[PDB]
From a paper:
Identified from African donor 17 of the IAVI Protocol G cohort, the PGT121 antibody family consists of three primary members (PGT121, PGT122 and PGT123), and additional antibodies from this donor described recently. One of the main characteristics of the paratope is a 24-residue HCDR3 that forms an extended anti-parallel β-hairpin with either a type-1 β-turn at its tip for PGT121 and PGT123 or a distorted 310-helix at its tip for PGT122.
Notwithstanding, negative-stain electron microscopy (EM) studies enabled characterization of the PGT122 epitope on the soluble HIV-1 SOSIP.664 gp140 trimer at 15 Å resolution. The EM reconstruction allowed unequivocal identification of three PGT122 Fab molecules bound per recombinant HIV-1 trimer and elucidation of the binding site and mode of interaction. PGT122 interacts with the spike at an approximately 120° angle in relation to the viral membrane surface if the Env trimer threefold axis is aligned perpendicular to the membrane. On the other hand, PGT122 binding to the recombinant Env trimer partially masks elements of V1/V2 at the spike apex, which appears flat and resembles the closed conformation adopted by the unliganded trimer. Combined with a relatively closed structure for the PGT122-SOSIP.664 trimer complex, these data lead us to suggest that the PGT121 antibody family effects HIV-1 neutralization by locking functional Env molecules in a conformation that prevents productive CD4 receptor engagement. Alanine-mutagenesis experiments in the PGT121 paratope were performed to show that the residues that contact the complex glycan in the crystal structure are indeed responsible for binding complex sugars on the glycan array. In addition, PGT122 and PGT123 do not have a lysine at this position, but rather an Asp and a His, respectively, which might help to explain why these antibodies are not reactive with complex glycans on a glycan array.
Author numbering:
A (entry chain H): 1 to 82, 82A, 82B, 82C, 83 to 100, 100A, 100B, 100C, ...
B (entry chain L): 8 to 9, 11 to 67, 67A, 67B, 67C, 68 to 95, 95A, 95B, ...
Write the structure that this text describes.
Amino acid sequence: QVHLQESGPGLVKPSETLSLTCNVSGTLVRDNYWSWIRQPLGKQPEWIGYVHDSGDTNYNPSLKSRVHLSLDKSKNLVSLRLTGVTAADSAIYYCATTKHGRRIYGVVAFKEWFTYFYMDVWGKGTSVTVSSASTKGPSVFPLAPSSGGTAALGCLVKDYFPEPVTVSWNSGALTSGVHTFPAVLQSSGLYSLSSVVTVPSSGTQTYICNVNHKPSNTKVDKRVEP
Amino acid sequence: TFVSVAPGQTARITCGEESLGSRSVIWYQQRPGQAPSLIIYNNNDRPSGIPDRFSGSPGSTFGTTATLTITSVEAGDEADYYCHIWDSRRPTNWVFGEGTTLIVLSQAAPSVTLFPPSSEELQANKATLVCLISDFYPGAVTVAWKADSSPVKAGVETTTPSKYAASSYLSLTPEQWKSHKSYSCQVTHEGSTVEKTVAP
């Protein structure tokens, strides 16, 4: 299946250069147009540019002097560099396969012919925070079960920066009953979040939350017990 | 903007400026916590996996706005929707149209859960009370904390809820936690207030 996976630093300081990679499987990069798209928190997507091995490539004018897009055929990846970043560049960044279509009329309407692009396969996205604040890894604590025949149970992921943190349960073998809350940005300027699972109260299965904070290369497995 | 609709009914979502030239409109759907995904291209063509409940207004009558219609709406359709406009008489749009949030009123009252500090946090000389609030609509709550009967003036951090679920955290020292008889999380929602309490 065509599958795109973006990666990046999570945190970049103002004035630095943002460098992102989009790892591609299930198709060869030379055979597609590629777009990068970004979406700030609470806002709509903004198209950064599209690139093709042919040279049929174009950049968003507002970013023109700061952006570079590339394809690496040997490694089958797509790259972005964005220079002189500021807080306005904070967003989730996405890689997408980009298909091309044409609106074609009678020759009497030739001036109105045009091409359009649509993004048909997107990656999961990589979060980019441009901030002068330093990275901080989370502290992870278990939220012990105590009390319908069902109990709740969770993990507290405390005081990290920047976003995001991913939490899974039993490495992915528990996605039902699961609610991972959106993070709170605290007055300290650090984030915290919690994830909970709902389970039947009766000493079978083991419950472990797996927390990963990519920006700080932190991975924590936390067993949660009564 | 926002559009709310009952399950089974028809939703319509408007996006972009009034048309000038011939049009090709692309629509994307974004589910909470997910990437946008393509829903419609070339005004009314659908990619693989998209049912004919979703339809786009022709790139047609001059001076009109593009609309996405969703018939027989289900709760799975709840999402943000964005269009990307191609208009033969305008420059390329590098920003998508402003999004619209589709609300599906399946229908409301919050589930609240309140955790004491973990032994492990206490062993690190810290303490956090965790008040989890979920499964409520509409998405307005206020949270207040009590120490015994006294209002807490400090250490509270509470999320703005999103698609609803919300969290409130009370940071305390271990001796503050052990001192009082109890602490309470009070959740105020649609005229009512739900309280849960926790004690050493």
